[PDB]
Design an enzyme around this catalytic site. Structure first.
Site, short mmCIF file in Angstrom:
data_model
loop_
_atom_site.label_atom_id
_atom_site.label_comp_id
_atom_site.label_asym_id
_atom_site.label_seq_id
_atom_site.Cartn_x
_atom_site.Cartn_y
_atom_site.Cartn_z
CG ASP B 25 70.65 -27.66 95.57
OD1 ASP B 25 70.52 -27.65 96.91
OD2 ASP B 25 71.67 -27.74 95.25
CB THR B 26 66.58 -26.07 100.16
OG1 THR B 26 67.17 -26.97 100.70
CG2 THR B 26 65.13 -26.45 99.63
N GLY B 27 69.71 -25.52 98.93
CA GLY B 27 71.10 -24.87 99.31
C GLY B 27 71.63 -24.14 98.16
C1 LIG Z 1 79.72 -18.99 97.12
O1 LIG Z 1 78.75 -18.09 97.23
C2 LIG Z 1 77.58 -18.16 97.82
C3 LIG Z 1 76.56 -18.84 97.18
O2 LIG Z 1 77.22 -20.06 96.57
C4 LIG Z 1 76.17 -21.29 96.50
C5 LIG Z 1 75.21 -21.10 97.09
O3 LIG Z 1 74.10 -20.36 96.14
C6 LIG Z 1 74.53 -20.26 95.05
O4 LIG Z 1 73.88 -21.22 94.17
C7 LIG Z 1 74.77 -22.37 93.23
C8 LIG Z 1 75.79 -22.56 94.57
O5 LIG Z 1 74.98 -23.15 95.42
C9 LIG Z 1 75.80 -24.36 95.91
O6 LIG Z 1 76.69 -24.93 95.43
N1 LIG Z 1 74.87 -25.22 96.75
C10 LIG Z 1 75.57 -26.56 97.37
C11 LIG Z 1 75.40 -26.06 99.01
C12 LIG Z 1 76.36 -24.93 99.32
C13 LIG Z 1 75.96 -23.83 99.65
C14 LIG Z 1 77.03 -22.59 99.84
C15 LIG Z 1 78.12 -22.90 99.60
C16 LIG Z 1 78.80 -24.14 99.10
C17 LIG Z 1 77.78 -25.16 98.88
C18 LIG Z 1 74.35 -27.62 97.37
O7 LIG Z 1 73.34 -27.08 97.92
C19 LIG Z 1 75.08 -28.79 97.79
N2 LIG Z 1 75.98 -29.11 96.85
C20 LIG Z 1 75.72 -30.35 96.20
C21 LIG Z 1 74.84 -30.07 94.84
C22 LIG Z 1 75.52 -28.64 94.12
C23 LIG Z 1 74.85 -31.03 93.94
S1 LIG Z 1 77.74 -29.40 97.82
O8 LIG Z 1 77.74 -28.39 98.59
O9 LIG Z 1 78.74 -29.68 96.60
C24 LIG Z 1 77.50 -30.90 98.72
C25 LIG Z 1 77.84 -32.17 98.33
C26 LIG Z 1 77.77 -33.21 98.97
C27 LIG Z 1 77.60 -33.08 100.37
N3 LIG Z 1 77.37 -34.19 100.73
C28 LIG Z 1 77.25 -31.79 100.75
C29 LIG Z 1 77.35 -30.72 99.93
C30 LIG Z 1 76.02 -21.32 94.81
#
Ligand SMILES: COCCO[C@H]1CO[C@@H]2OC[C@H](OC(=O)N[C@@H](Cc3ccccc3)[C@H](O)CN(CC(C)C)S(=O)(=O)c3ccc(N)cc3)[C@@H]21
Ligand SMILES: [Cl-]
Ligand SMILES: [Cl-]
Ligand SMILES: [Cl-]
Lengths: 99, 99
Positions: B25-27
């Site tokens: 998960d690059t996000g």
């Molecule tokens: C918040 O303060 C800053 C850090 O907050 C974030 C970032 O770094 C931190 O690490 C753990 C968490 O990261 C994430 O949660 N990452 C999500 C993306 C994201 C990035 C930033 C903010 C929110 C979401 C993820 O890559 C995608 N997600 C699905 C996955 C988690 C199975 S989804 O977003 O739910 C999603 C589901 C369906 C669709 N269709 C589109 C998207 C924290």
């Protein structure tokens, strides 16, 4: 390009003529953008992530340029913390993960 | 390997003697796993995603093997809906995005 992951993989996208910053996100099935205006009709979708579900607006067949690569596809709009480019558009621009 | 993004990029990980499936998960800044036991000290953290925040336990200096590649780093444990490998460990296995 090749993008390493020491910092967030934030790129510039262009949609409806406007530049925005978005995160290239391999963990997202779908592309979700913060509140904005798009043309045409939308349909309802519920998407889930870490903290539960949100309701978003689904717009189909929207042109969007991502790091200079053209795509046309589904864009979800709603109360996401950050703009995220998901696999539906990463596949269009030929993205893979490599190690 | 070169991992296609037509499907979710799921891989096998080994952690705390357990085999588990996880999403590359690059996000995700941070690696977050569903409830499990790990050894050593931890401290509480809130992490936030689509849908809001969850409380997790933060364990540091945890060894992990991802697709045969050994790494060490911080693992967050809590009520995530799915196991995610975030950038903190993706960097260590030399994972890049390419297009
Ligand atoms: C918040 O303060 C800053 C850090 O907050 C974030 C970032 O770094 C931190 O690490 C753990 C968490 O990261 C994430 O949660 N990452 C999500 C993306 C994201 C990035 C930033 C903010 C929110 C979401 C993820 O890559 C995608 N997600 C699905 C996955 C988690 C199975 S989804 O977003 O739910 C999603 C589901 C369906 C669709 N269709 C589109 C998207 C924290
Ligand atoms: Cl699409
Ligand atoms: Cl770490
Ligand atoms: Cl590197």
């Amino acid at each position: 390009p090749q993008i390493t992951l020491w910092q967030r993989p934030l790129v510039t996208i262009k949609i409806g003529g406007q530049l925005k910053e978005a995160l290239l996100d391999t963990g997202a099935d779908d592309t979700v953008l913060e509140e904005m205006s798009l043309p045409g009709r939308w349909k309802p979708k519920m998407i889930g992530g870490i903290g539960g579900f949100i309701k978003v607006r689904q717009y189909d067949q929207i042109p969007i340029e991502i790091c200079g690569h053209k795509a046309i596809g589904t864009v979800l709009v709603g109360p996401t913390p950050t703009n995220v480019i998901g696999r539906n558009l990463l596949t269009q621009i030929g993205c893979t993960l490599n190690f």
